[PDB]
Amino acid sequence: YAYFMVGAMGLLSSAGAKSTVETFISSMTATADVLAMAKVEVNLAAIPLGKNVV
Amino acid sequence: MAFRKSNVYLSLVNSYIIDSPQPSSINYWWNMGSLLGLCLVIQIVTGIFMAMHYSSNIELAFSSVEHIMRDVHNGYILRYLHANGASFFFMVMFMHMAKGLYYGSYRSPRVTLWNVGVIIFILTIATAFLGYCCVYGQMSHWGATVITNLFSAIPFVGNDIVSWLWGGFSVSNPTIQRFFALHYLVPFIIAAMVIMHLMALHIHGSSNPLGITGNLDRIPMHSYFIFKDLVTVFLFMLILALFVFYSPNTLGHPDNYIPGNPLVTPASIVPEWYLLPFYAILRSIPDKLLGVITMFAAILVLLVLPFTDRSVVRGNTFKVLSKFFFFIFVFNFVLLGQIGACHVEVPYVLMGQIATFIYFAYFLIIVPVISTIENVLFYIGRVNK
Amino acid sequence: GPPSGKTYMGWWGHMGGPKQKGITSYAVSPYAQKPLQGIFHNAVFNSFRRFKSQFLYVLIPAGIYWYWWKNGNEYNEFLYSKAGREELERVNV
Amino acid sequence: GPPSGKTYMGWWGHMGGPKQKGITSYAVSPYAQKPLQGIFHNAVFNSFRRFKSQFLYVLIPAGIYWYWWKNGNEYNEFLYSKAGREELERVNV
Amino acid sequence: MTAAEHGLHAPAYAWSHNGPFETFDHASIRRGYQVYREVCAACHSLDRVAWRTLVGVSHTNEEVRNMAEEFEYDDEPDEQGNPKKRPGKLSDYIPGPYPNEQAARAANQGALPPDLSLIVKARHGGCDYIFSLLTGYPDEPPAGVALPPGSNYNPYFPGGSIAMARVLFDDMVEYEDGTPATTSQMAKDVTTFLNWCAEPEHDERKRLGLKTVIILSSLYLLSIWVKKFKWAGIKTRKFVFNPPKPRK
Amino acid sequence: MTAAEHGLHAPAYAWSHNGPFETFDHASIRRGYQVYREVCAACHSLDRVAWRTLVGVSHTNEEVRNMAEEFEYDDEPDEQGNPKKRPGKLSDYIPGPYPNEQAARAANQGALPPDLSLIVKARHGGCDYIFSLLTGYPDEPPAGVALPPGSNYNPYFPGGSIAMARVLFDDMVEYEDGTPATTSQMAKDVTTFLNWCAEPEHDERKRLGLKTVIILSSLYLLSIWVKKFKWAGIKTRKFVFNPPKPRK
Numbered sequence A: 001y002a003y004f005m006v007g008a009m010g011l012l013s014s015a016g017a018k019s020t021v022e023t024f025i026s027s028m029t030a031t032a033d034v035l036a037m038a039k040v041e042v043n044l045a046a047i048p049l050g051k052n053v054v
Numbered sequence B: 001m002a003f004r005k006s007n008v009y010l011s012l013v014n015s016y017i018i019d020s021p022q023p024s025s026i027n028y029w030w031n032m033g034s035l036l037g038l039c040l041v042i043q044i045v046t047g048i049f050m051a052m053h054y055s056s057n058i059e060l061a062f063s064s065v066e067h068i069m070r071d072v073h074n075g076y077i078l079r080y081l082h083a084n085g086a087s088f089f090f091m092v093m094f095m096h097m098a099k100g101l102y103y104g105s106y107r108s109p110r111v112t113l114w115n116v117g118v119i120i121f122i123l124t125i126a127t128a129f130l131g132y133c134c135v136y137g138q139m140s141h142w143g144a145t146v147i148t149n150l151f152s153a154i155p156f157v158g159n160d161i162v163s164w165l166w167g168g169f170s171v172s173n174p175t176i177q178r179f180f181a182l183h184y185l186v187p188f189i190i191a192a193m194v195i196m197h198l199m200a201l202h203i204h205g206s207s208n209p210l211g212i213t214g215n216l217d218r219i220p221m222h223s224y225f226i227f228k229d230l231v232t233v234f235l236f237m238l239i240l241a242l243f244v245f246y247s248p249n250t251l252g253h254p255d256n257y258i259p260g261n262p263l264v265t266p267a268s269i270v271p272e273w274y275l276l277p278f279y280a281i282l283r284s285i286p287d288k289l290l291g292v293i294t295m296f297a298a299i300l301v302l303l304v305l306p307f308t309d310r311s312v313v314r315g316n317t318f319k320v321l322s323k324f325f326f327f328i329f330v331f332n333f334v335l336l337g338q339i340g341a342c343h344v345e346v347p348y349v350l351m352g353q354i355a356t357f358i359y360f361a362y363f364l365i366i367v368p369v370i371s372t373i374e375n376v377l378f379y380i381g382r383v384n385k
Numbered sequence C, D: 001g002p003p004s005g006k007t008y009m010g011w012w013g014h015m016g017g018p019k020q021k022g023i024t025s026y027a028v029s030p031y032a033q034k035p036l037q038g039i040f041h042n043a044v045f046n047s048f049r050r051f052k053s054q055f056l057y058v059l060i061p062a063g064i065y066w067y068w069w070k071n072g073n074e075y076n077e078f079l080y081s082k083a084g085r086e087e088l089e090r091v092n093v
Numbered sequence E, F: 001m002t003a004a005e006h007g008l009h010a011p012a013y014a015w016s017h018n019g020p021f022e023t024f025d026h027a028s029i030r031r032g033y034q035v036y037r038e039v040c041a042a043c044h045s046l047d048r049v050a051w052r053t054l055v056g057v058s059h060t061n062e063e064v065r066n067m068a069e070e071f072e073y074d075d076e077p078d079e080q081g082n083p084k085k086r087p088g089k090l091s092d093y094i095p096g097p098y099p100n101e102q103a104a105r106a107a108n109q110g111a112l113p114p115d116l117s118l119i120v121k122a123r124h125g126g127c128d129y130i131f132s133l134l135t136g137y138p139d140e141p142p143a144g145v146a147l148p149p150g151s152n153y154n155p156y157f158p159g160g161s162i163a164m165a166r167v168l169f170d171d172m173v174e175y176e177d178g179t180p181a182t183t184s185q186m187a188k189d190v191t192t193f194l195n196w197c198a199e200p201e202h203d204e205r206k207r208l209g210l211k212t213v214i215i216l217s218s219l220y221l222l223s224i225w226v227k228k229f230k231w232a233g234i235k236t237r238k239f240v241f242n243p244p245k246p247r248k
């Protein structure tokens, strides 16, 4: 019984530690507006033959 | 009983600055270590007074550096002193390393000390890269890109971790923001590690230059070695002044002074002088994962030096071949750095590969066989039959 | 206080070094002698003796790597000097 | 370490307290004890007796200051209630 | 500290979103935004919320765009450097109708129109206080009180003088069905909307709080038990004194 | 890597201010600015330095105000919200004629022109290599090299191709005196001017450096002496080992 109580405490503590660490770590991940997947168009009419357009 | 050794806040300082029986035969290298400590503290102080007037956004990071350059009274001195003191700190740390390796301080009774130290080494390399990113010039942006992407060599999942550390899919506000915050954080962790370094040192004193027992006689710390530190720190101040006033832009490279532009990069992109030795071995072997692992493997092969030096006689003050090989190794190290600086063409790939081979070979196999030969020669010379 | 591990150096009085008898030291105090004794004679003579003793250990490695560096530079120069069509191709691969 | 000053508490074995004899401490071990031997009787009775024995020490100051605060408040809103010309000006001004 | 300068203390209304386990009634945010866009119009700002967070909370996926292509945002120039206007996209904020600041003080006939994006999180009380301001106007101005021209009275504004009138009349929104012509309804919608926009994280916050409080309560009780357990090895030890033999 | 793409190493010119004690000859900045404004008008930027630092190093005072009365800088909005423009003052930066970035690639028929404000700090061999580049151009490109039409050659630039229209001719500036109309003069003046604008702090930097060097050398010698002094209390000691009687 005593070891079961200690194990229950450890289980709850481990779940909580996992949750807190996940919170802190996911704090640093990419935010929302940075996920703006930009789209661009390029005009190919006036590009020179032997030139590189970036 | 004397008040110096009674009050706790002073009983601590007594045993480390006022009464610490250093060995009799000290030379200038441990004074050089004290110089390094003072370089660290002045770096911290000028860094505080730097960040006092430094912004953090990506759009207003370069403008912040020009602002600290001119629009603050007596401020250009702060910025140049920060940069050149950092470079001089790295050089003096390299010389601290080379000293330690030569005189055999890495013998067994100080392995904890030596490990802690190399931890400061790797931390400090990280700090230098972090700050160089904090500048965000032109080539610092590409350096940050490459070193962040380094972790993508990790098997299976490599893109998620780099994208996490890199704050998104592009170098943007979170990237430099996090880099600067971590740069401003880490040196205090360095301070904690170096107070541990001092703790680990105090257990067994400091090694003799002769590589022999120093418990016989010792002379008190203060009023003798404080001035040996003073002379060398004055030399440091004057040489730093010479490099900060008359010759500012020599140690660094004249490329940081460009606005960040992730569209064009110059064909000549190199790290600052104190990262060339590892960059050379990285660009030497023709693989991604191999290079990424072999950098930290260079650090680890530094680590492996104890319980490998199997000379019963400590140090390299009485081994002609061993000291000759150490000199070939240090000149190897400088050659490695310089070839890393130079461009890679036909006569250089072989040069660099051979350089890395002899480097790691000196760490692994040169020390044991040469040491054993020295030991057996020492035995055979002075024995009849 | 909490006892700690064994240490190879004690403090004053229990320093831990081998006990000795018959050794006699001396001193003359800083104020009774000229601070700069020898200053020049010892400077020049000991400097030259020390530089003579260890000359080769720094001479040989420097010479070896200088020879390497010179050979590499000269070959690199020859490579890209009116030789990019007859020597560069056959060694680049 | 260097010798330190005299202290009235030490480490285990040299506590430094007065030497005792005849004291005989016992124990029961936590496993074979059934922790909550008293959990409702002890709780209610001890809690109420302890609340009784230290009741006045907080009732008196709190009541004093509550009375003070109530009087101050009531006078304050009496000031700003059809009395700003007759009562306000005789103390405020 | 007179009553006139401080305003009526806020009442205790029986909110719908209040309570430790309650989310928003955001079947009405869908119309709270509608009424806000109709009636606030070019007066208040709300320039802190991004159209990528009204999706999945009040609007499904595509309506947010289908109004986002009705604005302009002045993005990057063409090959000639002339700045160009393009239709709005899904990750751009709502434009404050008054361009920079000055047209605001030119049109309100008075002070700056306070930013609504965080207003109801930035007033004393506040959850009811905005409701009180919106419905507190007496239908007839109070008798025997001086009032500067233009400004209208308020029994709730500290100081009793508000620069904005009361445009909260009846039968002027008509959301989709039979519901308007009750100014309390529009007030309720707008206050719920602003309470959401002050923090678009109410639901998730409440859920995480419930999870954390349950976990912590269980952990705390377990810790109580374990403290009672291993401390019991000394909370019951008994000492028995013996008079030592008197010999020395 | 070949010398063609590496660029000729800059010859070590014996520059006037390249000395431990020498200062900027800002008897020449007074015309360096003149030539810079006259010839490099609508091509580069110099958009970093503020006019409140030219006074007291190059110009007297009222001249900078008289020049600032020629540019406009978009003052704060008026009462009606219509933006206005007001003449510049002693807290403004020089405006590069290209508005933001796009006209740069529109007009140069090439790439962006770097801001000269720090250019001679960000090239190897900074002090020179700009005089070298401005006067090192040859009249006729070396035989056997093909270049894109409309571009110009420069053997000193890495790659040997630059979009610099060689506007460094003679009989063009005529500063105030008989000195211009030789292409060395304008190049030299602009070189010193730019070397100043990268750090308009050289004079006091050199003075302070001289003070520090003298103080530190004196303190170094004193410290050497004192170390030789108090260390002598142990360096001169002696030992006379008298072995004990072998009794045990």
Ligand code: HEM
Residues within 6 Å of the ligand: B029, B030, B031, B032, B033, B034, B036, B037, B040, B096, B097, B100, B105, B106, B113, B114, B116, B117, B118, B119, B120, B121, B194, B197, B201, B205, B206, B207, B208
């Ligand atoms: C901020 C960083 C560091 C500080 C402040 C520091 C400080 C010191 C100090 C005060 C000493 C005593 C002798 C001397 O001053 O040199 C010392 C000695 C030593 N340090 Fe460091 N150190 C640092 C980094 C390192 C690192 C990174 C290493 C090794 C990886 C290292 C290895 C040693 C060794 C081996 C000694 C031996 C002294 C002896 O054997 O005589 N140190 N250090």
Ligand code: HEM
Residues within 6 Å of the ligand: B040, B043, B044, B046, B047, B048, B049, B050, B051, B054, B064, B065, B068, B079, B082, B083, B086, B087, B089, B127, B128, B131, B132, B134, B135, B183, B184, B187, B256
């Ligand atoms: C020994 C530890 C440190 C080292 C080696 C170090 C090194 C550097 C380097 C190399 C740079 C680049 C600057 C340049 O390019 O001119 C830099 C920048 C900077 N560092 Fe550090 N730094 C250290 C500690 C700190 C600390 C403790 C702070 C703040 C308290 C700090 C604040 C800064 C700031 C603000 C910059 C700004 C970039 C600049 O303006 O150029 N640094 N550091």
Ligand code: HEM
Residues within 6 Å of the ligand: E039, E040, E043, E044, E108, E110, E111, E112, E113, E114, E116, E119, E123, E130, E133, E134, E162, E163, E164, E165, E167, E168, E190
């Ligand atoms: C029902 C929609 C509206 C809401 C929810 C709303 C909300 C608010 C709030 C919360 C305040 C601040 C009250 C205080 O300071 O604590 C305020 C003040 C103000 N509102 Fe409104 N408002 C609305 C309609 C309007 C309209 C249509 C106008 C303009 C014609 C307007 C102009 C102003 C002005 C000028 C103030 C500033 C008065 C002052 O602070 O001195 N409002 N509003």
Ligand code: HEM
Residues within 6 Å of the ligand: F039, F040, F041, F043, F044, F108, F110, F111, F112, F113, F114, F116, F119, F123, F130, F134, F161, F162, F163, F164, F165, F167, F168, F190, F194
């Ligand atoms: C006479 C004073 C001038 C100085 C000191 C000057 C300085 C410079 C410098 C240092 C560079 C960059 C060189 C490098 O990358 O190493 C540069 C590039 C450039 N300058 Fe100037 N410049 C001057 C006049 C002009 C004028 C009059 C024009 C336009 C007609 C011009 C247009 C450009 C362009 C287009 C580039 C970049 C395009 C390319 O790389 O080919 N410059 N200038």
